[PDB]
Amino acid sequence: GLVPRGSQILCVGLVVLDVISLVDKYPKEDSEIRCLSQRWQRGGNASNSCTVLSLLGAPCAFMGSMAPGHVADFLVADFRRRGVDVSQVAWQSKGDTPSSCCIINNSNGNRTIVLHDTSLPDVSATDFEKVDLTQFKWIHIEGRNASEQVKMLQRIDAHNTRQPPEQKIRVSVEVEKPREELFQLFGYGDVVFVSKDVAKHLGFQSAEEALRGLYGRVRKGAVLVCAWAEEGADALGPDGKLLHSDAFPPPRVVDTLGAGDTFNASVIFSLSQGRSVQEALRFGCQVAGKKCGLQGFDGIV
Amino acid sequence: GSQILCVGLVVLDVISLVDKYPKEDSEIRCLSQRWQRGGNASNSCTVLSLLGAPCAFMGSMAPGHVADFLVADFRRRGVDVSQVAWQSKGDTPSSCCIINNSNGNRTIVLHDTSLPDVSATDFEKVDLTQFKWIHIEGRNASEQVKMLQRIDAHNTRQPPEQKIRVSVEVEKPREELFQLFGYGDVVFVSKDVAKHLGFQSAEEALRGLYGRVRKGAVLVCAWAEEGADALGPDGKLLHSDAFPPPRVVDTLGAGDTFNASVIFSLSQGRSVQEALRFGCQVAGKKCGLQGFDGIV
Ligand SMILES: CSc1ccccc1Nc1nc(N2CC3(CNC3)C2)nc2c(NCC3CC3)ncnc12
Numbered sequence: 075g076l077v078p079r080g081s082q083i084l085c086v087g088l089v090v091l092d093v094i095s096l097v098d099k100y101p102k103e104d105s106e107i108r109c110l111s112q113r114w115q116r117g118g119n120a121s122n123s124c125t126v127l128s129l130l131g132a133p134c135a136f137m138g139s140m141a142p143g144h145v146a147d148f149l150v151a152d153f154r155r156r157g158v159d160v161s162q163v164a165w166q167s168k169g170d171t172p173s174s175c176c177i178i179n180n181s182n183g184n185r186t187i188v189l190h191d192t193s194l195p196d197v198s199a200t201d202f203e204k205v206d207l208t209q210f211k212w213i214h215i216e217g218r219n220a221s222e223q224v225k226m227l228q229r230i231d232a233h234n235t236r237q238p239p240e241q242k243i244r245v246s247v248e249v250e251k252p253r254e255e256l257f258q259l260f261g262y263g264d265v266v267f268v269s270k271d272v273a274k275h276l277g278f279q280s281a282e283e284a285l286r287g288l289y290g291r292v293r294k295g296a297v298l299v300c301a302w303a304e305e306g307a308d309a310l311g312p313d314g315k316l317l318h319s320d321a322f323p324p325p326r327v328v329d330t331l332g333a334g335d336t337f338n339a340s341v342i343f344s345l346s347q348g349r350s351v352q353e354a355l356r357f358g359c360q361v362a363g364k365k366c367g368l369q370g371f372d373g374i375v
Numbered sequence: 376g377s378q379i380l381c382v383g384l385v386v387l388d389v390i391s392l393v394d395k396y397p398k399e400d401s402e403i404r405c406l407s408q409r410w411q412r413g414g415n416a417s418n419s420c421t422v423l424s425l426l427g428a429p430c431a432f433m434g435s436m437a438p439g440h441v442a443d444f445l446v447a448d449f450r451r452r453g454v455d456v457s458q459v460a461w462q463s464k465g466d467t468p469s470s471c472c473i474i475n476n477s478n479g480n481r482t483i484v485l486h487d488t489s490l491p492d493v494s495a496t497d498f499e500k501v502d503l504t505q506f507k508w509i510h511i512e513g514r515n516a517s518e519q520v521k522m523l524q525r526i527d528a529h530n531t532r533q534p535p536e537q538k539i540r541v542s543v544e545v546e547k548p549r550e551e552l553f554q555l556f557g558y559g560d561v562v563f564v565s566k567d568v569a570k571h572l573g574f575q576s577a578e579e580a581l582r583g584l585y586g587r588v589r590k591g592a593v594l595v596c597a598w599a600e601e602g603a604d605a606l607g608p609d610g611k612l613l614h615s616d617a618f619p620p621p622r623v624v625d626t627l628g629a630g631d632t633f634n635a636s637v638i639f640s641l642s643q644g645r646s647v648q649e650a651l652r653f654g655c656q657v658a659g660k661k662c663g664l665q666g667f668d669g670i671v
């Protein structure tokens with residue numbers, strides 16, 4: 075159906091089906107055991123942010139790769155259950171739709187993971203070329219396949235080059251795997267999210283060390299953003315002023331999985347409503363804090 | 376009287392092929408992944424079908440998207456599902472199977488729904504005429520013994536020529552299942568059970584377990600790479616070496632391939648030595664492949 079011009083936030087990245095099994099003890103190889111409970115969850119960075127943006131009330135769409143099959147079917151039904159627009163999915167003729175097996179040991183909390191395979195092709199610059207941008211007010215890009223996503227960021231530059239500032243598409247970018255290739259993305263986007271995990275791998279020991287240490291890599295005008303779990307979040311604009319907001323503990327921690335994706339989506343949401351970076355950092359921390367003390371995304375409002 | 380029937384579980388097998396088995400708290404990436412129609416009786420149907428034997432599955436299934444997948448697969452394989460006992464409480468069981476591609480080890484983590492078992496009631500409602508053979512997967516004992524008795528009874532009224540051959544699996548160490556040994560013409564007891572009951576080889580198990588079977592039965596016991604053995608009324612031990620494929624790459628469903636194949640050979644009137652041998656021949660071929668496609 076019809077989507078008004080400049081109304082949606084698009085997130086480009088991975089979606090994955092996570093099968094999550096709760097067990098008594100860790101299974102010894104070659105055994106047949108009952109679990110305590112099992113969940114199928116839609117997962118992936120761009121995937122969760124879309125969920126959040128919908129709960130938060132933004133019209134939103136997801137672009138990532140799927141393969142026709144029963145796994146897609148479930149994934150697409152969960153997306154749709156959360157109000158996400160999937161009209162831009164990149165259906166692939168080759169490969170498996172990503173699925174992961176996660177096993178959680180009850181008596182200790184340990185999480186073991188068999189990660190999804192690498193059979194399916196990522197979204198590509200030509201795939202992306204085929205997309206009429208006018209619907210989007212904001213596009214956000216999970217960092218995965220760097221050299222291609224670069225062409226897409228360049229496409230969005232082009233488009234923008236020719237629009238009145240009030241019809242310009244804002245861009246955000248996320249670097250979250252400690253992978254050499256990803257670092258070029260730093261130079262793109264109006265907003266750049268970097269993760270505790272990545273920043274540590276580059277040697278920095280805190281948001282402040284990371285922002286000040288990496289801001290030299292961001293394109294002029296950009297806001298560089300970093301969250302540090304219970305130590306809060308920071309942000310660094312072109313004016314050089316290091317911003318900060320403390321965390322917000324929930325009455326008690328229940329599920330941290332996906333909180334970074336909640337933080338990103340919330341910051342993006344706030345900035346898109348024209349709030350100030352400081353107000354965004356704040357909001358970010360508030361909603362991610364609330365998520366942590368909840369199971370999945372249901373109660374975040 | 377042309378079909379073979381199997382009574383047990385169907386399960387959605389969410390499979391991950393990895394090259395080494397993950398250690399506590401670690402994180403590895405699989406080589407590939409697939410969905411597969413699972414459950415013992417389910418697998419056996421697959422194998423019977425692939426061998427050209429008309430067969431039919433019977434077990435509980437909850438309607439949903441999972442079931443739809445299972446059903447379609449049953450049909451692509453010509454398994455008669457018209458005997459299925461649908462529910463309205465619960466969902467389709469499913470599990471995560473980690474298959475270690477470097478020795479074919481298979482770790483199964485099962486989510487058993489509360490989904491109701493098949494009951495003597497449901498069973499008492501089936502036309503026993505179409506079946507040369509009926510193989511029961513031992514899950515709910517006290518309730519299945521009734522199913523069996525209904526079969527023993529049906530036998531009395533028929534020529535010692537048109538009787539319903541009956542086979543029985545005892546795969547899990549559960550105490551309740553132990554009453555089942557004394558039923559059906561052929562009885563499959565797994566290596567696992569065997570060891571749990573203090574026995575160290577198929578030879579010894581067979582000796583120490585024959586006491587528990589119906590008069591005139593054959594006790595069968597596979598033992599992976601060691602082969603499988605059998606014991607009949609004549610008191611003579613039968614043996615068959617295994618048939619190792621070049622590389623073992625996937626042993627999920629081997630035992631259910633063994634059983635189907637033994638059953639199949641028997642329903643074609645081959646001898647117990649010949650069926651034991653064929654069982655190993657097929658389970659063996661199976662272990663060198665991902666899936667079932669291609670054992671024939
Ligand atoms: C700045 S908000 C944020 C952003 C990204 C990721 C997580 C968060 N928020 C929180 N993360 C974690 N955590 C902990 C882990 C789980 N593995 C690391 C992230 N703990 C808390 C907390 N209390 C718990 C602290 C551990 C004692 N209270 C509020 N927000 C967060």
Ligand SMILES: CSc1ccccc1Nc1nc(N2CC3(CNC3)C2)nc2c(NCC3CC3)ncnc12
Nearest residue numbers: 480597599600602603617618619629630633655658
């Ligand atoms: C008697 S055939 C049989 C019956 C039921 C279940 C399995 C099998 N067959 C085999 N199972 C296993 N296995 C291994 C496990 C997986 N952990 C137990 C079952 N390994 C082999 C094998 N392995 C390699 C050869 C020694 C070189 N070669 C032939 N048949 C089987």
